[PDB]
Amino acid sequence: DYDELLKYYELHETIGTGGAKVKLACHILTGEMVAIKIMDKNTLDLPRIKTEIEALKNLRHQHICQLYHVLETANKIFMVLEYCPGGELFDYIISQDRLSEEETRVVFRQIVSAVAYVHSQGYAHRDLKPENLLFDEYHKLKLIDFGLCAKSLAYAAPELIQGKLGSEADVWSMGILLYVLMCGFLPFDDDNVMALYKKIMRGKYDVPKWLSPSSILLLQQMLQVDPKKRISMKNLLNHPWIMQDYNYPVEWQSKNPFIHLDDDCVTELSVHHRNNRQTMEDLISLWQYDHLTATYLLLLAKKARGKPVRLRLS
Numbered sequence: 001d002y003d004e005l006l007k008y009y010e011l012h013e014t015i016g017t018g019g020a021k022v023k024l025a026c027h028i029l030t031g032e033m034v035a036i037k038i039m040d041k042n043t044l045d046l047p048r049i050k051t052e053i054e055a056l057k058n059l060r061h062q063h064i065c066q067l068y069h070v071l072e073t074a075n076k077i078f079m080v081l082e083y084c085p086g087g088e089l090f091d092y093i094i095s096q097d098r099l100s101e102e103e104t105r106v107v108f109r110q111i112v113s114a115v116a117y118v119h120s121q122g123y124a125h126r127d128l129k130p131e132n133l134l135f136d137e138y139h140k141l142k143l144i145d146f147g148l149c150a151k152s153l154a155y156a157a158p159e160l161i162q163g164k165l166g167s168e169a170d171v172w173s174m175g176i177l178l179y180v181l182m183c184g185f186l187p188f189d190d191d192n193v194m195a196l197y198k199k200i201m202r203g204k205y206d207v208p209k210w211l212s213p214s215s216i217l218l219l220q221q222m223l224q225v226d227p228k229k230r231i232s233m234k235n236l237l238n239h240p241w242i243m244q245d246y247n248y249p250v251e252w253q254s255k256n257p258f259i260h261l262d263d264d265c266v267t268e269l270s271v272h273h274r275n276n277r278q279t280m281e282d283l284i285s286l287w288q289y290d291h292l293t294a295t296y297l298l299l300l301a302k303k304a305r306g307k308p309v310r311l312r313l314s
């Protein structure tokens with residue numbers, strides 16, 4: 001089962017195991033580290049993986065953890081993704097107790113950027129929480145886990161739980177997230193699942209003394225039980241709180257394109273393929289998420305880190 005995969009990657013330690021597992025690995029042609037999520041097809045739950053793949057094939061963003069390569073044997077599925085060394089936002093909050101307003105703003109703008117983009121493309125994430133945000137090599141946030149996306153109860157909006165409106169529910173989840181960043185605990189919690197549900201429907205929460213009046217006001221706009229009264233994604237982008245100490249709205253548009261190609265990465269792939277430029281371009285622009293896609297995108301990442309755009313051809 002690991003046979004096709006080992007043509008392309010050096011497998012290292014397994015660094016996470018859940019109900020899928022995650023293996024660290026090196027991509028041989030570029031020497032870049034990657035993180036391969038591995039699913040068994042017999043013990044699976046399945047169309048959750050299919051949703052995620054098709055979402056990550058169509059989404060590409062500076063704050064979305066990038067998919068490079070999809071492989072499938074008769075009993076396994078491999079998703080080769082960006083390696084984020086910094087770990088989960090959840091763990092970071094635990095280590096810090098809570099973030100100050102300033103640092104919360106820094107991280108939160110990155111969350112809003114990703115979710116605004118996901119929404120611009122016609123998806124809702126639907127499982128936004130700090131476990132699904134990872135710090136990359138530059139301590140920048142990356143959104144993961146698009147399995148429940150569409151065209152955790154503590155983070156679910158009241159209307160989503162009542163089963164009735166996807167863009168608004170993400171704003172609620174972001175509101176819960178915002179609270180957890182600045183407080184270190186959830187605004188609605190209970191051991192009993194139905195009592196928690198009840199608390200969420202009421203929409204009443206403790207407001208700690210250390211929150212600034214601006215924070216409080218924004219939380220209140222985000223955590224409106226009625227989604228019609230809830231602040232929209234658009235108005236969140238240039239909200240006074242979000243703008244404080246930046247003075248410009250969240251830059252949400254993608255800087256990682258499908259249409260434009262990097263000339264140096266194309267040149268290097270051309271020599272490997274003994275290809276003409278125009279035909280190497282057409283081949284890359286099919287975006288099949290095969291080894292070409294992976295090698296092209298990992299060369300770009302190499303370039304972005306100030307390393308030479310070079311394949312290791314042995």
Ligand SMILES: Cc1nc(Nc2n[nH]c3c2CN(C(=O)N[C@H](CN(C)C)c2ccccc2)C3(C)C)c2sccc2n1
Binds near residue numbers: 021036037086087
């Ligand atoms: C496991 C782990 N991953 C790390 N970095 C990562 N880089 N790239 C990725 C991760 C984690 N990823 C991931 O899909 N995790 C899922 C999260 N699901 C449950 C919401 C997961 C975690 C554990 C077991 C199965 C699946 C991707 C994006 C591949 C890092 S950094 C320091 C520790 C560490 N531990």
